Amino acid sequence: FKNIDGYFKIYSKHTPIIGRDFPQGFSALEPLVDLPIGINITRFQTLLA
Amino acid sequence: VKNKCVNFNFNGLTGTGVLTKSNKKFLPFQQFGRDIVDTTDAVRDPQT
Numbered sequence A: 001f002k003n004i005d006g007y008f009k010i011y012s013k014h015t016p017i018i019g020r021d022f023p024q025g026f027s028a029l030e031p032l033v034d035l036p037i038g039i040n041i042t043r044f045q046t047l048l049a
Numbered sequence B: 001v002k003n004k005c006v007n008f009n010f011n012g013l014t015g016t017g018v019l020t021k022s023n024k025k026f027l028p029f030q031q032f033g034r035d036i037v038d039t040t041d042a043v044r045d046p047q048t
C-alpha cells in the first residue's frame, strides 16, 4: 500500500508454494487497482473474521 | 493501418512510425511500453 500524491496505489501477488513461512525466493508485485483517494493517512489497522 | 509509415495519436501519444502486430507479453495493467533506451516501442491497441 502506497499513497504518494494521493492516488492510492496497491499491488498484489499470490504464491501458495509448500515451503515454510516467508521464503527467500523472489516474486514481483503486480498493480491491481489504482484509485485516486487523495486524503490524509497516518494510521493503519487491519480486521479479522 | 499496419505495415505502413503513419502518424499516430495513440491515447494522446503523438508520433510517427510503422505499426505492426507484436508478440510481447503486455500484462493487463500495462499501457504504454518502451524499449531499452527510453523510447516508446510497443503500444498495445486500446480497442483490440
Ligand SMILES: *[C@@H]1O[C@H](CO)[C@@H](O)[C@H](O)[C@H]1NC(C)=O
Residues within 6 Å of the ligand: B046, B047, B048
Ligand atoms: C469501445 O471501447 C470498449 C472498451 O474496451 C470496447 O468495447 C471497444 O474497444 C470499443 N467498442 C466498439 C468500438 O464498438
